[PDB]
Design a protein around this ligand. Structure first.
Ligand SMILES: Nc1ncnc2c1ncn2[C@@H]1O[C@H](COP(=O)(O)O)[C@@H](O)[C@H]1O
Ligand SMILES: Nc1ncnc2c1ncn2[C@@H]1O[C@H](COP(=O)(O)O)[C@@H](O)[C@H]1O
Lengths: 366, 366
């Protein structure tokens, strides 16, 4: 079977790494020299606006998936008319727009931050009067790593925020600050028949709006149950096939949806080395029409390498650390790799502290 | 760092699968369309007799290794003059010739089958008179999967055996049958400094001269100690760097060396899914000058898929089985993949029996 992936970045790279031993063949649409290239059969660089050409490319393969939900959902719908694409155009459309995403949650009685669509400065001032400060003005689309937003605490910030972001082509959204204690994410995978394989919750730590650490399983039976029920609704309503990620704010035993990504997700990279079947292998199994792999898991920490990565020689000296370099070009704010470590004993804690020390020396976050 | 691999078969494929997340780049010398191609950066098809061209290719890279010890050890020595090759020309020379291999063991007080170099029919008759029947006449070189040999039990078999094999360009060897209860193998990896990382013993089951099943760890502290000591001698004498495989006959608490392979080996494929660091990742680490990864292991069975492989859909239904298709062309006697399964509980035994049933339907051994 041949799987086409829109995107040739690190997620596609890891999808191919996971799915290739299954006997599947991988082809990417992306730029040559992108990091998935050396682990896939072909990479073809087609401009994504050239719809007919993208479709023509897609039809060479048996199933299509994608690594970035920011892509055109009409493009997906076109492709899907001709060759199966997972997950759905609906999942893309809803997950890629903060307004549609939060509105969807609200429509199904699922908690989010209080939010207001912002199409004028007055609308913004009204949202601040209603729902308070601090708050964030965000682009509805193409936001990533906390970019494309402006935090608001003073009245003077309102006009400043508006002046910067007002011309964002796909609009804006006001979000009120959420009162939360910590953050977790629910990753799961849904097969062709709607069966869902669940990972345990992962507790995610952020720095400057970028995820820097993920630890799983996060043990809280109450919270896990709620997350799974929320996951189930999304899978049903999206008729979802593939790996799905849901990020939550946690306050007490209440979960609040932050946002979702219709794909394998940074907060699940731990499963490469902490689960019997990773988020990547299971995404591939799902879209290939196969029964999903067992997701039994063991305590694992994932550490992100942003802007830089410690020398492989130094990493290798911590002989239990599992190394995941994406073979990317070091650059401030750029995710160039991650590290996984199972945590069983004190010797693991030792290496962990040592890993964090190495990361602190190499890391460059924006 | 760039690693050149002589060979583009399944071992090179798995070497790249293991080493790529380490941030290493892989290039093979082999035929285009070979199974390593889709997971490496380049495959270059150079005739191996064209020595200068092979060397020219090799110098593009930082270190060279190989997946098949049947290659020319003088070729290796030439390459190594210009760019580091691991393991050594010595390891190749000794391991690739049954006579040199057994003579080496004898020279170091290591048990093997009784053996005699055969260069005439009389020599053969003399070896039979001396060391008895049954016995095997084998080619000294290029034997694999039990091919290139003739078993001898009757006096009439002697002349028959000789008539078939007499013109083997690199000669022949008589081996007397070994009295043994079962077979095990010791795989280990030696780094640039001579540090060795040991895997637990694997108990190997053969059918028609081909390995069909490998189970690890094989728990016998006495036997393991002897194996490690034998492994150590080889590493020192070969000045060995890389993964090394030693196959043994077992009788009581005595080990008898069968043969060695200077490389990752079928009997270690279980470590992909049963060890913290696989034989493949550790070979790559070794040759790349890195500290080796922890080899803590869990009970795992590996089953070979020979001649054929069960449908991925059927395999996937056994959701704990780890699938390793080499994406190869089905053909009698051909190793087209393997399956790994951790064994912890009764549910695993269930899937295991079910795997074996599937394999029995797809398998074609010669
Ligand atoms: N309404 C909010 N209240 C508090 N923190 C937020 C809010 N929205 C986003 N964040 C932070 O921003 C991170 C993700 O940013 P984003 O790219 O907007 O999803 C989250 O993990 C939070 O730390
Ligand atoms: N001298 C011997 N006595 C008994 N069995 C042998 C002998 N030599 C080889 N074998 C069998 O042949 C297999 C490997 O064949 P080869 O390719 O010759 O190493 C071993 O695993 C044994 O089952």
């Amino acid at each position: 079977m041949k799987i086409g992936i829109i995107g040739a970045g690190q997620l596609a790279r890891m999808l191919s790494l996971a799915g290739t031993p299954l006997g599947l063949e991988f082809h990417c649409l992306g730029k040559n020299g992108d990091c998935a290239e050396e682990v896939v059969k072909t990479v073809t660089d087609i401009e994504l606006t050239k719809v007919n050409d993208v479709v023509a490319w897609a039809k060479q393969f048996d199933v299509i998936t994608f690594e970035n939900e920011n892509i055109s959902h009409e493009l997906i719908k076109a492709i899907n008319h001709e060759v199966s694409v997972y997950p759905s155009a609906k999942a893309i459309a809803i997950s890629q727009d903060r307004l549609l995403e939060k509105s969807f949650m609200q429509d199904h009685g699922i908690a989010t931050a209080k939010f207001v669509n912002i199409d004028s400065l007055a609308k913004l001032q009204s949202a601040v009067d209603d729902h308070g400060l601090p708050a964030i003005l965000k682009t509805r689309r193409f936001g990533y790593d906390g970019k494309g937003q402006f935090v608001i605490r003073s009245q003077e910030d309102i006009t400043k925020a508006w002046d910067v972001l007002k011309d964002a082509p796909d609009g804006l959204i006001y979000e009120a600050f959420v009162d939360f204690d910590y953050e977790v994410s629910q990753i799961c995978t849904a097969d062709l028949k709607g069966n869902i394989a669940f990972y345990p919750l992962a507790r995610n730590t952020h720095k400057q709006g970028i995820i820097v650490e993920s630890e799983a399983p996060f043990e809280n039976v109450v919270l896990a149950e709620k997350a799974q029920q929320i996951a189930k609704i999304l899978v049903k309503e999206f008729a979802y096939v593939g790996t799905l990620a849901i990020e939550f704010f946690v306050k007490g035993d209440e979960l609040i949806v932050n946002e979702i990504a219709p794909r394998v997700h940074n907060s699940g990279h731990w499963s490469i080395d902490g689960a019997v079947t990773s988020q990547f292998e299971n995404h591939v199994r799902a879209i290939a029409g196969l029964i999903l792999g067992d997701t039994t898991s063991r305590k694992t920490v994932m550490l992100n390498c942003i802007g830089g990565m410690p020398a492989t020689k130094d990493l290798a000296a911590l002989d239990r650390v599992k190394i995941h370099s994406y073979n990317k070009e070091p650059r401030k704010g750029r995710k160039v790799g991650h590290l996984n470590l199972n945590l069983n004993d004190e010797t693991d804690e030792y290496q962990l502290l040592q890993v964090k020390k190495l990361i602190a020396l190499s890391e460059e976050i924006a």
